[model samples]
Target chain A: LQMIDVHQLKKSFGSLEVLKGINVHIREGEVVVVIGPSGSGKSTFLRCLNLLEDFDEGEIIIDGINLKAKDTNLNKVREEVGMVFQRFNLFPHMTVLNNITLAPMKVRKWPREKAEAKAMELLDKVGLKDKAHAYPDSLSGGQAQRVAIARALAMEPKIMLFDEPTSALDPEMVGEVLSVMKQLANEGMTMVVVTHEMGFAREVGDRVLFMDGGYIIEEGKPEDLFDRPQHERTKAFLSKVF
Target chain B: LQMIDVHQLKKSFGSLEVLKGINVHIREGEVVVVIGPSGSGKSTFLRCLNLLEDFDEGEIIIDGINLKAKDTNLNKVREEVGMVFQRFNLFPHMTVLNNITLAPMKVRKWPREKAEAKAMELLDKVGLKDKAHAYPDSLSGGQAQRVAIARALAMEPKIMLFDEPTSALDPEMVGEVLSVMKQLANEGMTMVVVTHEMGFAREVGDRVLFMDGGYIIEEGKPEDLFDRPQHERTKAFLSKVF
Candidate 1:
């Protein structure tokens, strides 16, 4: 069964058509990777999924619930759909523990003790247990990204949407983050990643979606998509990056 | 005569010492790279040089001027010693052009048109000319760092201090930002970079310093430091990173 079903997704900014008649279905507990060049609307599409950006026309159903329905709680959908940005947007003034626990205590209404325990557990999983009290300003890029992931996980979301999570990390630090993500995938987290990390796509993603000109040009198994891409645009994009 | 002379530079917070009695010297226009494990005081030392952090005890001289002297004009010293932070702390509410021009117009007392002209020139140099009117939020991490560099260059400083400028960037974007730094080095811009990019250090640095536990344990040419590191601490640190 589909966790997310998007149909005829269309968005425009004045004269610019950023997303045009896009259709995608994400399966439950599946890893999906989206790859495209800059300004190709990959980011906009992800933003639309999370309602971070509104689409002019689209039908979005998350976990059998229609998101466009007037009575639907957008916050409820957001609670279940965790989004991670390219930049680690941890609150700079907050300690690593607070950064993780604040959302749960505020939005989810979890008890302080429970939330703190979960935060510490997640921090340990991300290899940042010792930095729980440290502020975001003191963190390295990799550590900050790990904290960001832990923060999202603290929300206990059913699905994770990563918008180029490693695109803002240093080359040496990229592996540490990918390893955390790989661990998540191994633990069966349903994830949709918009990224240029083709190796991660091929290794961890169950399916790969290649996009161009605001449309999904091709979707297939990771090996098939990477080894034998059918579209000229995909080939060109891969050539430039790889 | 030394361009930068640091003696017994020590900094501590509570009971933890971050930089312990470090001593170093750099000649005019020389490029220096500092590499170490996290918490080794590289960043603290850089902050001390720019007077962003007051050292517990030290003597720092830039071009024969004592920075820690009671009568020294810190504003004047800061103008001559520009700093680029790891997170590209460009003022988010300001436009890119304003971020580059504000320091020069306010601190250096440059005329509006002249400051703007210099800002534009540096923006172009960093390949961010099109983003002159863009806010910091709209630019990519790499683009923001480029703007940060442009902002620093607008000060027309005698020396530049970069604290891992590319540490917060994507792997693919690192090359573009480093290319700009390499270009500056080629033009004989005096720079002291705290970075983990060993390749860039080996290629551009006149000297490489390795520190651990707040001490400069090894200092030599890049080849000597990277390949023939004498200190066991240096070897252990390089092994983990390289």
Candidate 2:
């Protein structure tokens, strides 16, 4: 049950070639963590999953749909994949409840009452039920990031993508967000996380992939790779940011 | 020959205490590297050396002058200490040579020819002599950073402070800047660098200091600390970013 199947993914920004013929397979209910130095293609690879970035050459098959196909419906593919950015891209003007329910009510065609109930359920799961009526600006960095998670969950995405979700957070506030993500993993949700949190990667990830020089240089179970990385580049990169 | 001596350094932003009772001693002509997680007060400590940041409760003695003293000549202290920031804070409108010589000619009251000659000598050392007439915005990330280094050096400062100087550079560009800094270290320029380049730290640093939770958790030679960090926190910190 492969949720994502990427083949020979390639992307370029003007003259700079970012992603160079990368390949990956992500199964259903699997948790994959991607780690790399800055300027690696980790974020670009994550963005390519949801069509946030259109690659020049690649095959992106999400669930069963060919995302790169000419007739592929983007909105349909997006409904199954939810993304969480580092900066917590929440609608500042809207209340937490409104922010969460908007996509469900508008896109999923759920009634207002039904959508609100589902939003509250997600907020409660994220430990932010009390912040339902609060605007995004009023929330702390941790609270806001948690709400962003809940908002993504309201879509009930089959696959979740986190792009360095804890990079912008203070050290003390990071654990709270990681806890919610850990709970998500235990619940058997398929997730792809690009993060600097080696502890979380070791603890929660079923597979860890090291991306560098626009390709997946090495990947394996946390224990095997972290303890005994075979590749020279892997060993060097792991040394810099374990 | 103490270049810098800090005692009970404390700093706060409104209510958030960033640096709390931190202490360090940096000897003349020695290179010290500071490493820690983000928001761990590493940059604050570097900035305090040149009075770029003022501490709430602490003493900063640079070359035997008390920085916290009200009557101390800040200009004299700053003239002796050159600082480079993560962002290449170069003047966008000015040519590289103009940017470098402005301080020397205006502040030190040197003649125009003398300042320009000194500026060109520094630029040649940084491998940017060809770009002496180029504007900052026209140079590459690596080139601009090298020019910033040259600008700092033109003041003939006895001590140099780098606040994550290479963090903003691309992977390939990082080596060029680090090579320059390594050369400076070989020439016995006293330097305190707050950087994530562990390789550079290991090779160029005379001493390594691990800062965490508003304190220096461990300090030792790179081989002793990176190879066998004693403190649990130091081990954990090094593991995340070796």
Candidate 3:
């Protein structure tokens, strides 16, 4: 059964049209790699799923909740879905442990000790447990991003949306982060990633999406989309990134 | 003048010798992509740069210091150079801030506050400021890799090396990580990336090095090495990734 169903989803920043008539579905544990040049509305599409950006039209049903419902509880919807970003929006003022613990304490209604314990556990999982009490300012780019990942997971999100998670790290550091992401996939986490890293998509993605002009121009299994993409746009973008 | 010079670099593991007479030169701000199959000494060659794996015989000179000199301090060489690995070596027990701070506090002898301040700044630059207190397990693979990158950069190394950084990530997470690496090159950080992501090698790297059986099979500009590689090994590997 599909875990997410999006039909004719549309969004625009008022006068500027973006994400025109998008439709897609995600299966449980599915990995979809989204690729396109800039201005393709990839970011907007992800935000709408988590209700970070309200969609102008269409229907989104994730884990059986319709987002367009009159009383759509966005807060609860957010609980089930997690989002990682190109620019990680970690709270700058909070300690790394507090950043993660507060989420579980507030949203999940867990006790402070329970949240704190799990917070450190999550921190440990992402390879940064020792920085639990340290502030964000003391962490490096990669480490800070890990804290973000740990913070999101403290919510126990079922579906993860990443908006270019490694877009800001140094070249050598990219691999350091992707390795942990691989661990999640093996555990069957449902993920939708909008990214330009072709190797991951080609080797690991179950499917790939190519977007242009505010529409999903092409999508298919990773090998088919990457190796034999029939669309002109796919070839053009692939040639450009290379 | 070349900032890095390696002459007859060699490494041995018991009866097997991996890196055989490896020679390479890297100028300031140059991005070099190293490609080779398994059993090839790509990792060994990179480790030799910072003394991660000591070479049996070779001259590895970075900046103005010759690593071969008996008086050369291995710790000093490590301080000036950084390496990112396929496996994100994030300390699962440490917090993000502490992960970054320990290196500076212990190795560089900076105070905890100064090291932390710089660590957070590095994290901020990489867009991960909020994840400072997280543990490793709680993070997605991409998140941990970013932390690894940030940790390496926390030392303010002059040259950086990557060992298939994205090879371990889920497909969708790979692209998000590569963008950060792109920023490093743009910022004029000298880099040597050992990767299967030919796209990065072709588009971002200034040059490409093809190695097989511990020998520098071919080395030249990306276009020359990738597009018109005069060697058979290079063609064999490119066919698999591309």
Candidate 4:
């Protein structure tokens, strides 16, 4: 099934237009890697998929739900679409277990016992079961990010969106978080990732998109986009990053 | 009056101890600056003051209420204390005005009209009245940080805690944020700041603290801390940064 469908998506910030007429479609279990320059609207596009951002124009349909409709239940859309940020926005005051279980108990209305059990399972999957009782402030950046991914998974989201998930991490800590993501990809999670890591995109992306100047200037299979560049802009951007 | 009093505050992450028995007494209207190497617990110390990160052992009293007590109202303490992180932490989905007004309408129970008025006033103070309708994704790092400060101030906090507020910004954007902070210092806002800007700490800080290995190794008037270092570690650290 087509998990995400976008048509004529346009977004602007005051006088500055960020996303100017973008289009993309992804099927279930497809890993779409979006690469771009700083102001290229890549992050804006990913956020729009979940309605974390409102668009000035165009339509977005995720998992068969229309997000642009005024009466669309945002909570329901968010439940199916999980997002992870660069900073791993975990609550510092709550323990790891509580952080993972909170949304499920409140939004899903699951009982405490079921929520706690699911949280433990997710924590184990992330190799952080030992840290269930630990506060976020104590964990290293990589460990905290792993917990964030696990928390998102606890929601049982069918589509996952990652916005530069490892950009804030130290160089040494990047691998652990990426490895967890790769495993998720291998297990057939439908994910759209925005990142600067070229190797990750080249190796794991089912399709790669090169966005620039508020548009998707180039996009194709990873090998086609990386190896055989038709556009000078894509080639220039790739050279600088590489 | 003592705005912040911390005694024997300790924090740890699994086997790694971060803050090892930190203590400090900050007077009202005083600007205290903390300087330290990475992983020296400077940020942890600041997070602890607002109970953003709970300590293993500590007696923390803010504006005369003991935080460690069982019956202490955390929301009350948090309402009186404001914080700004290295990242601006503005909600991506919310407009600038809405981001500033959210806490007031929800926590303080203010009417939407009153909250919006206060939010506009804060936006004007931060020189972002034009961006009141803008979203955070549209702002530059400096503008966002300014908005964060204004958001913190909108609560009418008596004490402000800033944890490396400008560290995440680009070099050109740093000074604008520091200028706002300097203005706040001049206006007698009691603040505890953790940062690496030596010149800012030297000029704006009433007292400077040098922390090493999770302990406050040295502290005194900014002049003494910057110009005449007593400890070898402090001297070593200051020389490298300068």
Candidate 5:
């Protein structure tokens, strides 16, 4: 029931063509990990799935709604396709709880008590219940990403997109962030993540998508993709980054 | 009868200071235009007016309500102080009508008919009545800006802030965008505009603020400031950009 179907997705940054006819269908509760070199359009593909970077030609159908349709309410789509970024794009001045409670209160118009209680639950589940009152600047990078995850979950999105969620964290902090993501995968959250952590990808991701030169070079079961990559480009990229 | 008051405004990005000790009062129906070179924090200052950028230390009181107060609803503050950006950040997929209608419908919980009717009224004023069904990407730069202005105005703000509204438009498109803004000025709307258009600043602005190094270096009536300048830095800046 929770399937995202993408067809003929294409995008360009001026003269540089980025996503060249890429396509993928992420099913309900599937964790898809995408890996690629820089400029390979992995980030761009994830971004376009939510209409963040405008695609030149494509169709993304989620829950029977065509995102590329001219009449589509983009705010609704953005609300549904919650995203976590590399930098943890948390609102700086607001406390961790406020960051989680904002969209529910402001966008969904949930009553303050309901929103606050829901946010508190998300905070506790993510292991930052004590830090709810802390501002984003006061938290470590790992803690902030956890709050970012909680903030997205606050919206009750149908699917989540994570772009390099742990890339900016310290080497030691990566495990904690990866563990929080693992919990989400176990809970059957449909997620698309672009990351360099092959160990996490191999363990937590249901399938792996290896991309290069704006194309999905190979995609399959994570173990197969990691241990038995089909293409030379995929093998080379895995060897260098893995 | 009413005013917008800002006191001791200060903000920074990590170590780079953006706004330093910004103090100003804009009365009801007053049109204040801010001019400065790149990186002087003109855009940051205007963005802060609506609490879009969280300032480290500052107070903004509009109609006796402090925007920076933790207890205050910032969304209501944003509602009263509508803003238009340089890039005309419209929803690309939605029609012009939906773009104008969204905030009103979602934030205010307005019924669809009322939102749509009010949106059409604003679109009619912007001379975009026929463009109600047109997607933003289909519109020309000038048309898009006019729609952007209408989108902000649809919120029925007590004050409107323009952050370099014409900076991104094609040279030929500038005149039309300015024309719509000129119309807004004539309607006794309280406005704070940041711009490089000295002509609009001279003709439409009730007062001009010259900014540099994160401070409003000089401010006065446009004729006096532009012709009989006060500060050397202001003179130097005006000389270079003019």
Candidate 6:
């Protein structure tokens, strides 16, 4: 089933056009990896999906709801679309369990007992149950990112979006995060990942999208897209990265 | 002449002892690299050198001035010892140039013009002359660290202490900051670096110190220390890192 259907998405910042007439379709239980150069609008595109940035013109349909419609409740849409940032944007003042439970309790109106139980379960899944009471400052980059993932999962989002999750971590810590992500992928979660780690994309991604100059230049199965990139831009980009 | 002297340093946090009777001496213009396992108190030891952390018991002498003396002004001692943390810790509200100049103006009573001129010189040395007017958020991780180094140099300290300066940076960006540090080492700046980059330590460190369980387990020339660490603890630590 189509989980996300975006058509002709366009966004501009003053004179600079970031996303221009982009089209994308993501299926449920499929991992889509978006790879591109620095200024290719990968981050801007992800931000628009989460309604962090409003698009100038587009159609974003998530689970049969139109995000750009006038009557669309953005907060409701945000509840189903979870985002994991590169920097693990956990609230510094809140403990790990509180960070995981805040959205569920506030937005979903989950009961305290239910939220706490779910938060603990999620923490256990991320191998951070022992650190439930620890502040974000006390956790390592990998542990913090895992907590961020668990925090997002507490909302019971149908789809998860990762924006270069391992990019900010130490080399030794990256594998631990990737291991968790791989486990999530195996368990059949719908995920959209914007990453520079080609190995992760090729190994885990069901569909790989190669973007350039704010456009999806080429996209297909991981092996086809990576090994036999049709466009010169895709080949050149992969050369620089891999 | 010895620039830094530590004798039987002991520090504790509640019931946990961080530093346990550590002794170290750093000669003038020497670059010493400290490497150890996590929770081995490398960072605590560095903080103790600048009196950022008051040791429970110890004596520290920098340039023949005892920091343990009751009448000694810690601020004065800090003026001669500059530190760079893993997190750039640059003032987010201030421009890069302002971040560099603020400390010199407030701490050393240097004229704005003189401070800014020196700041620009250091910015040039770090290849960030163009970023002087930019805010910390606008710069990359490597650029922010370079600006931070420039900020420290603006104070004209006799010795520099780095607590994993490259730990927070991307793998590709580590070389840029290490190159700047190598340039400083070539200029005979007294520096104490706590890092995991064995390549940089082997190339630029005059002495390499390996610490474990809150004590210095081995110290020797970089070549001998890295290639064939003497103590069993040192060998085990190097094995884990390498």
Best by DockQ: 4
Model 1 chain A lowest lDDT segment of ten: A86-95
lDDT of 3: 0.81
Tens-digit lDDT track of model 6 for A1-242 = 58988999988878988788799988888999999988788877887788767798878888778996789888888889898877625754356899889989999899988999999999999888999876665689889889989988899888899988898788989988998888888888889998878789879999888888878899999999989989999999999985
| Per-residue accuracy of model 6 over B163-215 as CA lDDT, tens digit each | 88898788999999999899988998999999999999989999888888888
For B1-242, candidate 1 gives per-residue lDDT tens digits of 78789998889988888888998888888999999988888877887888766778878888778887888777777788888777735764356899899989998789999999999999988888998975565788788888888888898888989988898677988988888889888888889999999999999999999988888888999999899989888899899986
Better of 4 and 6 by DockQ: 4
Residue lDDT tens for model 5, B58-108: 787886788866798888788898988665257644678998999999988
Off by over 4 Å in 2: B1-242
* Every candidate's chain B TM-score: 0.96, 0.96, 0.96, 0.97, 0.96, 0.97
Name the 10 consecutive residues with the lowest summed lDDT in model 4 chain B. Answer: B85-94
Q: TM-score of every model?
A: 0.58, 0.51, 0.51, 0.76, 0.55, 0.56
Give the candidate number with the greatest lDDT: 4
Better of 1 and 4 by lDDT: 4
**Per-residue lDDT of model 3, residues B162-232, tens digit only:** 87888868898788678789989999989999888878877799988888898988888888887887888
**Count of backbone clashes, every candidate in sequence:** 0, 0, 50, 0, 0, 0
Q: What is the interface RMSD of candidate 4, in Å?
A: 4.3
Tens digit of per-residue lDDT, candidate 5, span A1-242? 64789888888877878888888888988899999887788777877877666778777787557886778677787778888877525754356899899999999999999999999999999899999875565577788888889999999988889988898678999999999999988998889999999998889898898888878889999889888888999899988975
lDDT of 2 by residue, A1-242 (tens): 58999999999978989999899999999999998887788877887898777899979899979986789898999998998877525754357999899999999999999999999999999999999876564577788789989989999999999987888677888999999999999999999999879899889999999889898999999888888998999899989874
Candidate 5 chain B least-lDDT 10 residues: B85-94
Model 1, residue A24: distance off in Å is 0.6
Q: Lowest-lDDT window of 10 residues in candidate 2 chain B?
A: B86-95
Q: What's the alpha carbon RMSD for model 4?
A: 4.8
Q: Which residue pairs in candidate 5 collide?
A: none
Model 5 C-alpha lDDT versus the unseen true structure: 0.84
